[PDB]
Amino acid sequence: TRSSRAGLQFPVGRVHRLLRKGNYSERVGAGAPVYLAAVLEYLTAEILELAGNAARDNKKTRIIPRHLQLAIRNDEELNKLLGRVTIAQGGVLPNIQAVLLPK
Amino acid sequence: AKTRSSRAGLQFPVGRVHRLLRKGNYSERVGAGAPVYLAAVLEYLTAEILELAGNAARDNKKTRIIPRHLQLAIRNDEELNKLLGRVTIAQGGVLPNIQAVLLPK
Amino acid sequence: NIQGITKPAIRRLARRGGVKRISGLIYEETRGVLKVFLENVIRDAVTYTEHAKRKTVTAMDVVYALKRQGRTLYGFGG
Amino acid sequence: RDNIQGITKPAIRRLARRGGVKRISGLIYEETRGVLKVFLENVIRDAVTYTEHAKRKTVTAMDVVYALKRQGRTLYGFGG
Amino acid sequence: HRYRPGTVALREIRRYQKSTELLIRKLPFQRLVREIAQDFKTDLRFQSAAIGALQEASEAYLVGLFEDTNLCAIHAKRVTIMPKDIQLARRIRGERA
Amino acid sequence: PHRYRPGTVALREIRRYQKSTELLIRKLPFQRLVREIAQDFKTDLRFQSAAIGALQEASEAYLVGLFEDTNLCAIHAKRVTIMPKDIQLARRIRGER
Amino acid sequence: KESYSIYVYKVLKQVHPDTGISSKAMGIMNSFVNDIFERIAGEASRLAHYNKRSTITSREIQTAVRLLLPGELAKHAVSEGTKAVTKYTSA
Amino acid sequence: RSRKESYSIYVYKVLKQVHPDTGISSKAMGIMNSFVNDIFERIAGEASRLAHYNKRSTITSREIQTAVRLLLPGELAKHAVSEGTKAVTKYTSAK
DNA sequence: ATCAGAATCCCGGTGCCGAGGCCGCTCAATTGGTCGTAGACAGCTCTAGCACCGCTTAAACGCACGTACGCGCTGTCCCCCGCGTTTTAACCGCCAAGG
DNA sequence: GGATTACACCCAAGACACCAGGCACGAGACAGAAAAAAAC
DNA sequence: GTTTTTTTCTGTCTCGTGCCTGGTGTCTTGGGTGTAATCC
Incomplete structure (x- = not known):
C-alpha cells in the first residue's frame, strides 16, 4: 500500500477513488491524495490530542463527545474553524457572566 | 426551427448551458431536458426581478437603471431580500432608515 | 399543538444558555421563532424526500438540509 | 506606516x-480602525494566497472577488 | 424557611452546563414536529434517529440564541430578558427582514 | 446669528448621504493603507484599480452594517450616544470575533 | 468572452420596453446570473452525489429550484419551467 | 449485504499512536468520520474552484497545499503543510 | 463573623454492556504494461502599473464655547421565584369482563 | 414500502458535416448631469 | 434647505457590419436508467 510506502496511516487509493467519483476534476495526479491524507492525519492528530488532554482533565478513559466539544471551544484557531459547527451531545462552555453573580 | 432556442421560444442559448454543464465537472452525463429547464428558470428570474427594476427606475423619471435602483428594488421585495441576504451590490447603499426618535417633534 | 412546549x-x-431572570411574553415569542425555524428546516427536508420518491424522510436528508441552511451538524452520519 | 491613522474622523x-447613526462618542475611532484593519487583514491574506497559486505577481479584481466569495461576504459588480 | 432569590437558578445553571442530554423530552416534541410536517404532503413516516437529529439541532440553536439575547440584556443595563431583546438579536442575525 | 441649537444638521446630512450614491472614504490614503497591509505577507505586489475599488466598496458596506446594528443596540440602550461595547456586542453576535 | 447583454435587452423590451440601462447595471446583472447558475448547478451536483444518480434530468432541477428559492418564486418558476418543457417537447 | 464505509480503523490507529492508554465511544468515532468528511468536502470544493479559476483540470499536490492554507488558519495550517510536505518527500523520494 | 443546615461532592460497589479484540472472507488496491495530450516550459509583445510633479481647492484641524443627553442617584411599585399544593399525561399491568 | 436486481429501450456522446449568428468596433444621436434662477 | 425648471454640453448607447465559432443534423452504440419482481 502506498500509505505504508508513504509511511502514513490513511489509505491513499480510497481517497484517489473518491476524488474520481466526486467529479472533482477530469484527471487526477500522482501524489495529491498523499498530501491530502497527511493533512487529514495531522488535523485529526491535533484534534484528538487535545481530546486526550480533555479526558486527562476529567480522568475519563473513554472519550465522550463532551470532551470533543470542550476541546473545540477552548483552542482559538480550531474554534474559528468550526464556528458554524455543532455536535450532538455537545453542550457549551461552562460560562457565567459575573455581573449576574450576586453581591 | 433550426435552433433549440427557437424550438423553446426563449431567449437564452441552451447548448451554451449544456456545454457549461459538460465543462463544469458537474455530472458525468447531462440529459436533454435539464438545460432547457434551468434556462427557463433563469429567464423567469431575470424577467421577475427586472419588473421591480423597471418600477424602481420609473420612480425617479430616469430611463436608465442604476445600481441604487436595483438595491432599492431588492430591499423592497421580501423574497428577493431573503434571497440576497448575504449579498451586496456595488454602488448600492441601503434603505432610508430614519428612526422615529430622530425627527424634530 | 405548539402549546406542547412547557414553561420549564x-x-x-x-x-x-445560562440566563438568570425571565420575563413573561418570552414563552410565546420562543414558540413562534422555534416554529419558523422548524418550518424552513422540515420544508426543505420534505423537498429532499420528494426527490427521493420515498415515503420516509431520511436522517441523511435532514443533515443535508441543515447543510443547505449552513447549519452543519456532525454526529449522525453526515 | 501610519496610514492606519490616515483614517479621518470626518x-x-x-x-x-x-449608516444612520446620530450621536458619536469619542472612544470609537481607533476601535473602528482596529476592526477595519483586521477585516482587511483576512481579506488581503486570502487574495494574495489566491494570487500565490496564480504564479502572477499582480492581483486582479477577479481574485479579490473569489476570495470574498470564500468568506461569504460575497459582493457582485465586477464579475467573478 | 425561605431562600433568597436568584441563587437556585445560578446553581442549576452550574448543574445544567454539565449533562448534554436533551432538555425537551420526546413525545410532545415528536407530536409538534409531526403536526407541522402534516401540511406539506400527507402522513410521511419518520426515522427516529432523524427525530433525535432535529431535537439536538433545535435545542443547541435555541441555547446559542439565548446566549446572544442574554448578552444583549446585560448590555442593556438590566438582568431580565425582554422579547424586544430577542427581536434585537434576530435583527442582527437577519432571520426576519 | 442663526446658531441653531442642534437637530437639523445631523439628520439633514443623513438625508443627503442616503440620497447619495457614491463612496465616502477618499481614494489615496485607503490605497496606501491597503499597500501597507499588503507589504506584510508577500512583498512587492502590483494591483489593478478595480480590485481596490471593490475593496473600498465592501469595506464601506461592512462598516455600514456594523453601524446599523450598533445603532439599534443604542436605541435599545435608551440612548442615542454610541458606545464601543455596542460594537463589541454586535460583532459578538455576528460570530466575527 | 460572452456576457448576456442582448438577452437582457430582449427581456427588458419584453417587460418595460422603453427603458435604458447603464453599463455597470448590466455587469451586476450578469454577476447575479452567474451566481444563481452556479448555486443551482452545485446544488444539483449535490443531488446527484447524495442520490447516486449518474446524470441529471429536469426533475433534479425542479427540486433544486425548490431548495433555493422560497414559495411564490418557486411555484411560478416551476410553472414556467414545465411550460417551457411542454412547448419544447411538443416541437 | 451492501458494504458500507467508515474511517474508524484508521483514525483509531492514529489515536492508539498518540495515546496508547485511551478508550473512545462509538458515536464519537462516527463524529470524527463526519469531521473528515466535512474537511475533505471543503477542500475538494476549493480544489474545484482552483481548477475553474485556473482553467486547468489536473490536480497536483500544490493545489492541495494552497487549498489548505486558504481554508485553515495560519499556524495550524503551516504545521500541517510541513507534515504533508515531509510526507511528499518521504514517499516520492522512494517509489 | 458564625452556626445550622440544605446542597453538593466524592468514594466504594456492582452490574451490565458495548468497546474492543478477533477471525475468516473478496473485492478494490495493486502491479504491470500501453497511448497521449496538458502542461511545463521557452519565448514575443504591448499594457499598464508605477512613480513623479505642478496646479487647485476643497477638505481636515484646532479651538471657542455652550449645552444637553449620559449618568449617578433616588424612590417606588410590581410582579417573577420559589416553594408549596394539586394536575394530568403516562408506565406498565391486569382482572373483569363479556363473549 | 424501500433495497436489489434484471431485463428492457433508447436516446446521449461523439464524430463528422453545414452553418447563420455574436461580438468587436464605430457613429451619430440621444437620454442626461449639472448651472443656475428661483419658489416654499 | 428644498426642489423645481431652463440650456448645455456630453458621455454612453444603439444601430451597423464583418468576421467565426460555436451551434446544428444524425447515425451507433451503449450504458443508464425504466420498471418490475423479489427480498426484507
Whole structure:
C-alpha cells in the first residue's frame, strides 16, 4: 500500500477513488491524495490530542463527545474553524457572566 | 426551427448551458431536458426581478437603471431580500432608515 | 399543538444558555421563532424526500438540509 | 506606516450618517480602525494566497472577488 | 424557611452546563414536529434517529440564541430578558427582514 | 446669528448621504493603507484599480452594517450616544470575533 | 468572452420596453446570473452525489429550484419551467 | 449485504499512536468520520474552484497545499503543510 | 463573623454492556504494461502599473464655547421565584369482563 | 414500502458535416448631469 | 434647505457590419436508467 510506502496511516487509493467519483476534476495526479491524507492525519492528530488532554482533565478513559466539544471551544484557531459547527451531545462552555453573580 | 432556442421560444442559448454543464465537472452525463429547464428558470428570474427594476427606475423619471435602483428594488421585495441576504451590490447603499426618535417633534 | 412546549422547558433552555431572570411574553415569542425555524428546516427536508420518491424522510436528508441552511451538524452520519 | 491613522474622523462621521447613526462618542475611532484593519487583514491574506497559486505577481479584481466569495461576504459588480 | 432569590437558578445553571442530554423530552416534541410536517404532503413516516437529529439541532440553536439575547440584556443595563431583546438579536442575525 | 441649537444638521446630512450614491472614504490614503497591509505577507505586489475599488466598496458596506446594528443596540440602550461595547456586542453576535 | 447583454435587452423590451440601462447595471446583472447558475448547478451536483444518480434530468432541477428559492418564486418558476418543457417537447 | 464505509480503523490507529492508554465511544468515532468528511468536502470544493479559476483540470499536490492554507488558519495550517510536505518527500523520494 | 443546615461532592460497589479484540472472507488496491495530450516550459509583445510633479481647492484641524443627553442617584411599585399544593399525561399491568 | 436486481429501450456522446449568428468596433444621436434662477 | 425648471454640453448607447465559432443534423452504440419482481 502506498500509505505504508508513504509511511502514513490513511489509505491513499480510497481517497484517489473518491476524488474520481466526486467529479472533482477530469484527471487526477500522482501524489495529491498523499498530501491530502497527511493533512487529514495531522488535523485529526491535533484534534484528538487535545481530546486526550480533555479526558486527562476529567480522568475519563473513554472519550465522550463532551470532551470533543470542550476541546473545540477552548483552542482559538480550531474554534474559528468550526464556528458554524455543532455536535450532538455537545453542550457549551461552562460560562457565567459575573455581573449576574450576586453581591 | 433550426435552433433549440427557437424550438423553446426563449431567449437564452441552451447548448451554451449544456456545454457549461459538460465543462463544469458537474455530472458525468447531462440529459436533454435539464438545460432547457434551468434556462427557463433563469429567464423567469431575470424577467421577475427586472419588473421591480423597471418600477424602481420609473420612480425617479430616469430611463436608465442604476445600481441604487436595483438595491432599492431588492430591499423592497421580501423574497428577493431573503434571497440576497448575504449579498451586496456595488454602488448600492441601503434603505432610508430614519428612526422615529430622530425627527424634530 | 405548539402549546406542547412547557414553561420549564424554555427555562431549562435559559439555564443551559445560562440566563438568570425571565420575563413573561418570552414563552410565546420562543414558540413562534422555534416554529419558523422548524418550518424552513422540515420544508426543505420534505423537498429532499420528494426527490427521493420515498415515503420516509431520511436522517441523511435532514443533515443535508441543515447543510443547505449552513447549519452543519456532525454526529449522525453526515 | 501610519496610514492606519490616515483614517479621518470626518470620514467616520460620514459613514455614521449614511449608516444612520446620530450621536458619536469619542472612544470609537481607533476601535473602528482596529476592526477595519483586521477585516482587511483576512481579506488581503486570502487574495494574495489566491494570487500565490496564480504564479502572477499582480492581483486582479477577479481574485479579490473569489476570495470574498470564500468568506461569504460575497459582493457582485465586477464579475467573478 | 425561605431562600433568597436568584441563587437556585445560578446553581442549576452550574448543574445544567454539565449533562448534554436533551432538555425537551420526546413525545410532545415528536407530536409538534409531526403536526407541522402534516401540511406539506400527507402522513410521511419518520426515522427516529432523524427525530433525535432535529431535537439536538433545535435545542443547541435555541441555547446559542439565548446566549446572544442574554448578552444583549446585560448590555442593556438590566438582568431580565425582554422579547424586544430577542427581536434585537434576530435583527442582527437577519432571520426576519 | 442663526446658531441653531442642534437637530437639523445631523439628520439633514443623513438625508443627503442616503440620497447619495457614491463612496465616502477618499481614494489615496485607503490605497496606501491597503499597500501597507499588503507589504506584510508577500512583498512587492502590483494591483489593478478595480480590485481596490471593490475593496473600498465592501469595506464601506461592512462598516455600514456594523453601524446599523450598533445603532439599534443604542436605541435599545435608551440612548442615542454610541458606545464601543455596542460594537463589541454586535460583532459578538455576528460570530466575527 | 460572452456576457448576456442582448438577452437582457430582449427581456427588458419584453417587460418595460422603453427603458435604458447603464453599463455597470448590466455587469451586476450578469454577476447575479452567474451566481444563481452556479448555486443551482452545485446544488444539483449535490443531488446527484447524495442520490447516486449518474446524470441529471429536469426533475433534479425542479427540486433544486425548490431548495433555493422560497414559495411564490418557486411555484411560478416551476410553472414556467414545465411550460417551457411542454412547448419544447411538443416541437 | 451492501458494504458500507467508515474511517474508524484508521483514525483509531492514529489515536492508539498518540495515546496508547485511551478508550473512545462509538458515536464519537462516527463524529470524527463526519469531521473528515466535512474537511475533505471543503477542500475538494476549493480544489474545484482552483481548477475553474485556473482553467486547468489536473490536480497536483500544490493545489492541495494552497487549498489548505486558504481554508485553515495560519499556524495550524503551516504545521500541517510541513507534515504533508515531509510526507511528499518521504514517499516520492522512494517509489 | 458564625452556626445550622440544605446542597453538593466524592468514594466504594456492582452490574451490565458495548468497546474492543478477533477471525475468516473478496473485492478494490495493486502491479504491470500501453497511448497521449496538458502542461511545463521557452519565448514575443504591448499594457499598464508605477512613480513623479505642478496646479487647485476643497477638505481636515484646532479651538471657542455652550449645552444637553449620559449618568449617578433616588424612590417606588410590581410582579417573577420559589416553594408549596394539586394536575394530568403516562408506565406498565391486569382482572373483569363479556363473549 | 424501500433495497436489489434484471431485463428492457433508447436516446446521449461523439464524430463528422453545414452553418447563420455574436461580438468587436464605430457613429451619430440621444437620454442626461449639472448651472443656475428661483419658489416654499 | 428644498426642489423645481431652463440650456448645455456630453458621455454612453444603439444601430451597423464583418468576421467565426460555436451551434446544428444524425447515425451507433451503449450504458443508464425504466420498471418490475423479489427480498426484507
